Amino acid sequence: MRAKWRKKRMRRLKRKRRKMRQ
Amino acid sequence: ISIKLQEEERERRDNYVPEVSALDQEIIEVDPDTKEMLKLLDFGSLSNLQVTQPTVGMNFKTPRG
Amino acid sequence: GRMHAPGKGLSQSALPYRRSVPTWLKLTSDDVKEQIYKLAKKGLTPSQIGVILRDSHGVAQVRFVTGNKILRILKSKGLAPDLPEDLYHLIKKAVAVRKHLERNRKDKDAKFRLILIESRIHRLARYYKTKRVLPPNWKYESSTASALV
Protein backbone atom coordinates (compact mmCIF):
# COMPACT_ATOMS: atom_id res chain seq x y z
CA MET A 1 0.00 0.00 0.00
CA ARG A 2 1.28 3.46 -0.88
CA ALA A 3 2.42 5.26 2.25
CA LYS A 4 0.36 8.38 1.60
CA TRP A 5 -2.77 6.31 0.98
CA ARG A 6 -2.20 4.46 4.26
CA LYS A 7 -1.81 7.86 5.91
CA LYS A 8 -5.12 8.96 4.37
CA ARG A 9 -6.74 5.75 5.59
CA MET A 10 -5.46 6.38 9.11
CA ARG A 11 -6.76 9.95 8.93
CA ARG A 12 -10.20 8.68 7.90
CA LEU A 13 -10.10 6.15 10.74
CA LYS A 14 -9.28 8.90 13.24
CA ARG A 15 -12.09 11.08 11.91
CA LYS A 16 -14.57 8.21 12.15
CA ARG A 17 -13.46 7.51 15.72
CA ARG A 18 -13.84 11.19 16.60
CA LYS A 19 -17.36 11.16 15.19
CA MET A 20 -18.37 7.93 16.96
CA ARG A 21 -16.69 8.95 20.25
CA GLN A 22 -18.92 11.84 21.31
CA ILE B 1 57.39 -9.20 -38.36
CA SER B 2 60.65 -8.60 -36.49
CA ILE B 3 63.27 -9.46 -39.10
CA LYS B 4 66.77 -8.02 -38.68
CA LEU B 5 66.92 -6.97 -42.35
CA GLN B 6 63.91 -4.70 -41.82
CA GLU B 7 65.72 -2.99 -38.94
CA GLU B 8 68.80 -2.61 -41.15
CA GLU B 9 66.65 -1.06 -43.88
CA ARG B 10 64.99 1.33 -41.42
CA GLU B 11 68.34 2.37 -39.95
CA ARG B 12 69.84 2.95 -43.40
CA ARG B 13 66.83 5.04 -44.47
CA ASP B 14 67.08 7.10 -41.29
CA ASN B 15 70.80 7.70 -42.02
CA TYR B 16 70.25 10.81 -44.11
CA VAL B 17 72.02 14.13 -43.57
CA PRO B 18 72.28 17.25 -45.77
CA GLU B 19 75.40 19.36 -46.21
CA VAL B 20 73.80 22.26 -44.30
CA SER B 21 72.05 21.76 -40.97
CA ALA B 22 68.51 23.11 -40.82
CA LEU B 23 69.54 24.88 -37.60
CA ASP B 24 72.40 26.64 -39.43
CA GLN B 25 70.79 29.91 -40.50
CA GLU B 26 72.14 33.45 -40.67
CA ILE B 27 69.12 35.29 -39.23
CA ILE B 28 66.99 34.02 -36.33
CA GLU B 29 63.90 36.10 -35.61
CA VAL B 30 63.63 36.52 -31.83
CA ASP B 31 60.95 38.32 -29.84
CA PRO B 32 61.99 41.05 -27.36
CA ASP B 33 61.03 38.94 -24.34
CA THR B 34 63.25 36.02 -25.33
CA LYS B 35 65.92 38.63 -26.07
CA GLU B 36 65.67 39.78 -22.46
CA MET B 37 65.86 36.14 -21.39
CA LEU B 38 69.06 35.73 -23.41
CA LYS B 39 70.49 38.99 -22.04
CA LEU B 40 69.94 37.84 -18.46
CA LEU B 41 71.58 34.56 -19.56
CA ASP B 42 74.82 36.33 -20.61
CA PHE B 43 73.93 36.04 -24.31
CA GLY B 44 72.77 39.55 -25.22
CA SER B 45 75.96 40.16 -27.21
CA LEU B 46 74.99 37.70 -29.95
CA SER B 47 74.57 39.36 -33.35
CA ASN B 48 72.98 36.34 -35.06
CA LEU B 49 69.41 37.30 -34.09
CA GLN B 50 66.94 39.83 -35.48
CA VAL B 51 64.26 41.93 -33.81
CA THR B 52 60.78 40.70 -34.65
CA GLN B 53 58.13 43.14 -33.50
CA PRO B 54 55.59 41.96 -30.90
CA THR B 55 51.98 41.25 -31.74
CA VAL B 56 49.58 44.19 -32.01
CA GLY B 57 47.13 42.76 -29.48
CA MET B 58 46.48 39.89 -27.05
CA ASN B 59 43.82 38.07 -29.10
CA PHE B 60 44.94 34.46 -28.71
CA LYS B 61 42.07 32.69 -26.90
CA THR B 62 39.45 30.92 -28.97
CA PRO B 63 35.92 32.27 -28.43
CA ARG B 64 33.99 30.60 -25.62
CA GLY B 65 30.76 28.69 -26.15
CA GLY C 1 31.15 35.59 9.11
CA ARG C 2 28.57 38.31 9.64
CA MET C 3 26.59 38.16 12.87
CA HIS C 4 23.25 38.40 11.03
CA ALA C 5 24.06 37.35 7.46
CA PRO C 6 25.61 34.35 5.67
CA GLY C 7 28.30 36.68 4.36
CA LYS C 8 31.95 35.79 4.92
CA GLY C 9 33.52 39.01 3.72
CA LEU C 10 37.14 39.91 4.37
CA SER C 11 37.16 43.63 3.48
CA GLN C 12 38.68 45.70 6.29
CA SER C 13 41.46 48.17 6.98
CA ALA C 14 45.06 46.96 7.17
CA LEU C 15 47.15 49.05 9.55
CA PRO C 16 50.82 49.47 8.60
CA TYR C 17 53.45 47.93 10.83
CA ARG C 18 55.05 51.27 11.69
CA ARG C 19 53.38 53.08 14.59
CA SER C 20 55.23 56.36 14.04
CA VAL C 21 53.95 59.71 12.81
CA PRO C 22 54.49 60.08 9.04
CA THR C 23 57.43 62.19 7.94
CA TRP C 24 55.17 64.30 5.72
CA LEU C 25 52.81 65.05 8.62
CA LYS C 26 53.75 68.34 10.28
CA LEU C 27 50.74 68.79 12.57
CA THR C 28 51.58 68.77 16.26
CA SER C 29 49.56 66.52 18.55
CA ASP C 30 47.79 69.60 19.91
CA ASP C 31 46.94 70.70 16.37
CA VAL C 32 45.23 67.36 15.72
CA LYS C 33 43.43 67.73 19.05
CA GLU C 34 42.08 71.16 18.09
CA GLN C 35 41.02 69.89 14.66
CA ILE C 36 39.20 67.05 16.43
CA TYR C 37 37.53 69.57 18.74
CA LYS C 38 36.44 71.71 15.79
CA LEU C 39 35.02 68.74 13.90
CA ALA C 40 33.18 67.51 16.99
CA LYS C 41 31.71 70.98 17.55
CA LYS C 42 30.56 70.85 13.93
CA GLY C 43 28.41 67.87 14.92
CA LEU C 44 30.36 64.85 13.69
CA THR C 45 30.85 61.37 15.11
CA PRO C 46 34.39 60.13 15.85
CA SER C 47 34.31 57.88 12.77
CA GLN C 48 33.50 60.88 10.58
CA ILE C 49 36.21 62.94 12.30
CA GLY C 50 38.77 60.22 11.63
CA VAL C 51 37.67 59.90 8.00
CA ILE C 52 37.95 63.65 7.44
CA LEU C 53 41.36 63.86 9.11
CA ARG C 54 42.60 60.95 7.01
CA ASP C 55 41.23 62.24 3.71
CA SER C 56 42.02 65.96 3.92
CA HIS C 57 44.59 66.67 6.64
CA GLY C 58 46.75 63.60 6.02
CA VAL C 59 46.42 62.27 9.57
CA ALA C 60 46.93 58.57 8.88
CA GLN C 61 46.02 57.62 12.46
CA VAL C 62 45.07 60.00 15.26
CA ARG C 63 46.17 57.47 17.90
CA PHE C 64 49.72 57.59 16.53
CA VAL C 65 50.00 61.39 16.52
CA THR C 66 48.21 62.29 19.75
CA GLY C 67 48.78 59.03 21.61
CA ASN C 68 45.02 58.89 22.20
CA LYS C 69 41.93 57.68 20.38
CA ILE C 70 39.33 60.08 19.02
CA LEU C 71 36.53 59.07 21.40
CA ARG C 72 38.88 59.32 24.38
CA ILE C 73 39.93 62.81 23.30
CA LEU C 74 36.30 63.86 22.90
CA LYS C 75 35.46 62.50 26.36
CA SER C 76 38.49 64.15 27.97
CA LYS C 77 37.57 67.51 26.48
CA GLY C 78 33.98 66.86 27.56
CA LEU C 79 32.17 66.88 24.20
CA ALA C 80 31.49 63.20 23.60
CA PRO C 81 27.89 62.24 22.76
CA ASP C 82 25.48 60.83 25.29
CA LEU C 83 25.40 57.30 23.86
CA PRO C 84 27.96 55.51 21.67
CA GLU C 85 27.64 56.20 17.97
CA ASP C 86 27.32 52.56 16.89
CA LEU C 87 24.35 52.06 19.21
CA TYR C 88 23.00 55.44 18.10
CA HIS C 89 23.13 54.44 14.43
CA LEU C 90 21.55 51.07 15.19
CA ILE C 91 18.68 52.83 16.97
CA LYS C 92 18.37 55.29 14.07
CA LYS C 93 18.14 52.41 11.58
CA ALA C 94 15.53 50.69 13.76
CA VAL C 95 13.51 53.92 13.92
CA ALA C 96 13.66 54.27 10.14
CA VAL C 97 12.54 50.67 9.65
CA ARG C 98 9.66 51.10 12.11
CA LYS C 99 8.55 54.30 10.36
CA HIS C 100 8.57 52.43 7.05
CA LEU C 101 6.69 49.47 8.56
CA GLU C 102 3.97 51.72 9.99
CA ARG C 103 2.77 52.63 6.48
CA ASN C 104 3.80 49.30 4.86
CA ARG C 105 2.23 46.52 6.93
CA LYS C 106 2.57 43.78 4.28
CA ASP C 107 6.40 43.99 4.26
CA LYS C 108 7.44 40.83 6.07
CA ASP C 109 11.03 41.41 4.95
CA ALA C 110 11.03 44.73 6.80
CA LYS C 111 9.71 43.00 9.94
CA PHE C 112 12.47 40.38 9.71
CA ARG C 113 15.13 43.05 9.23
CA LEU C 114 13.72 45.00 12.18
CA ILE C 115 14.00 41.89 14.33
CA LEU C 116 17.65 41.56 13.30
CA ILE C 117 18.33 45.25 13.99
CA GLU C 118 16.74 45.15 17.44
CA SER C 119 18.68 41.99 18.32
CA ARG C 120 21.88 43.82 17.41
CA ILE C 121 20.72 46.83 19.45
CA HIS C 122 20.05 44.67 22.50
CA ARG C 123 23.39 42.87 22.26
CA LEU C 124 25.30 46.15 22.00
CA ALA C 125 23.27 47.70 24.83
CA ARG C 126 23.96 44.73 27.10
CA TYR C 127 27.67 45.02 26.33
CA TYR C 128 27.61 48.74 27.09
CA LYS C 129 25.76 48.18 30.37
CA THR C 130 28.44 45.64 31.32
CA LYS C 131 31.13 48.29 30.74
CA ARG C 132 29.14 50.93 32.68
CA VAL C 133 28.95 53.02 29.51
CA LEU C 134 25.15 52.99 29.77
CA PRO C 135 23.18 53.27 33.01
CA PRO C 136 22.05 49.87 34.32
CA ASN C 137 18.40 50.93 33.98
CA TRP C 138 18.83 51.89 30.31
CA LYS C 139 16.50 49.97 28.02
CA TYR C 140 15.67 50.26 24.34
CA GLU C 141 11.91 50.64 24.00
CA SER C 142 10.27 51.08 20.60
CA SER C 143 7.69 53.63 21.72
CA THR C 144 9.69 56.86 21.93
CA ALA C 145 13.12 55.75 20.65
CA SER C 146 12.81 58.44 17.97
CA ALA C 147 13.61 60.93 20.74
CA LEU C 148 16.88 59.06 21.32
CA VAL C 149 17.54 59.67 17.61
Binding site: - | - | A14, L25, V51, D55, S56, G58
Partner: protein, 82 residues
Protein backbone atom coordinates in the same frame (compact mmCIF):
# COMPACT_ATOMS: atom_id res chain seq x y z
CA UNK D 1 57.14 27.17 -0.84
CA UNK D 2 60.02 28.11 1.50
CA UNK D 3 58.40 31.17 3.04
CA UNK D 4 60.19 34.38 4.18
CA UNK D 5 63.30 33.35 2.24
CA UNK D 6 65.80 35.77 0.71
CA UNK D 7 67.34 33.14 -1.61
CA UNK D 8 64.28 33.30 -3.88
CA UNK D 9 63.15 36.94 -4.14
CA UNK D 10 59.44 37.58 -3.75
CA UNK D 11 58.58 41.27 -3.75
CA UNK D 12 56.36 40.31 -6.69
CA UNK D 13 54.73 37.38 -4.90
CA UNK D 14 54.11 39.47 -1.76
CA UNK D 15 52.54 42.61 -3.20
CA UNK D 16 50.38 40.32 -5.34
CA UNK D 17 48.77 38.78 -2.24
CA UNK D 18 45.82 40.18 -0.36
CA UNK D 19 46.91 42.91 2.02
CA UNK D 20 45.64 40.99 5.05
CA UNK D 21 47.07 37.67 3.83
CA UNK D 22 50.65 38.91 3.48
CA UNK D 23 53.40 37.75 5.82
CA UNK D 24 53.13 41.10 7.58
CA UNK D 25 50.02 42.97 6.51
CA UNK D 26 50.42 46.40 4.94
CA UNK D 27 47.93 48.73 3.24
CA UNK D 28 47.63 48.96 -0.52
CA UNK D 29 46.91 52.69 -0.23
CA UNK D 30 49.03 55.80 0.17
CA UNK D 31 48.95 59.51 0.90
CA UNK D 32 49.84 61.88 -1.92
CA UNK D 33 50.85 65.52 -2.01
CA UNK D 34 48.76 67.34 -4.61
CA UNK D 35 49.52 70.64 -6.30
CA UNK D 36 46.73 72.45 -8.07
CA UNK D 37 47.99 74.58 -10.98
CA UNK D 38 45.76 77.42 -9.79
CA UNK D 39 46.86 76.91 -6.18
CA UNK D 40 50.18 77.45 -4.41
CA UNK D 41 50.28 74.98 -1.48
CA UNK D 42 50.48 71.26 -0.79
CA UNK D 43 47.38 69.21 -0.07
CA UNK D 44 47.92 65.75 1.42
CA UNK D 45 45.12 63.53 0.10
CA UNK D 46 44.40 59.89 0.86
CA UNK D 47 44.41 57.69 -2.23
CA UNK D 48 41.14 55.95 -1.29
CA UNK D 49 39.48 59.13 -0.08
CA UNK D 50 35.75 59.13 0.63
CA UNK D 51 35.34 62.92 0.81
CA UNK D 52 35.11 65.50 -1.97
CA UNK D 53 38.12 67.50 -0.80
CA UNK D 54 38.69 71.08 -1.92
CA UNK D 55 41.82 73.20 -2.18
CA UNK D 56 42.71 74.79 1.15
CA UNK D 57 42.94 78.19 -0.54
CA UNK D 58 40.20 77.82 -3.15
CA UNK D 59 36.95 75.98 -3.94
CA UNK D 60 38.22 73.53 -6.56
CA UNK D 61 37.27 69.85 -6.44
CA UNK D 62 40.60 68.10 -5.89
CA UNK D 63 39.22 64.55 -6.01
CA UNK D 64 35.98 62.59 -6.02
CA UNK D 65 35.17 59.36 -4.16
CA UNK D 66 34.84 56.17 -6.19
CA UNK D 67 34.36 52.51 -5.34
CA UNK D 68 38.06 52.23 -4.58
CA UNK D 69 40.85 54.68 -5.28
CA UNK D 70 39.64 58.27 -5.48
CA UNK D 71 39.59 59.99 -8.86
CA UNK D 72 41.72 63.13 -9.14
CA UNK D 73 40.92 66.11 -11.33
CA UNK D 74 42.99 66.95 -14.38
CA UNK D 75 46.14 69.04 -14.11
CA UNK D 76 46.57 68.47 -10.36
CA UNK D 77 50.03 66.95 -9.96
CA UNK D 78 49.98 64.20 -7.33
CA UNK D 79 53.00 62.43 -5.83
CA UNK D 80 53.00 59.61 -3.29
CA UNK D 81 54.75 60.06 0.05
CA UNK D 82 57.25 57.64 1.63
Amino acid sequence: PLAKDLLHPSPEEEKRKHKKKRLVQSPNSYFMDVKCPGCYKITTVFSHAQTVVLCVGCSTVLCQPTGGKARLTEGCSFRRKQ
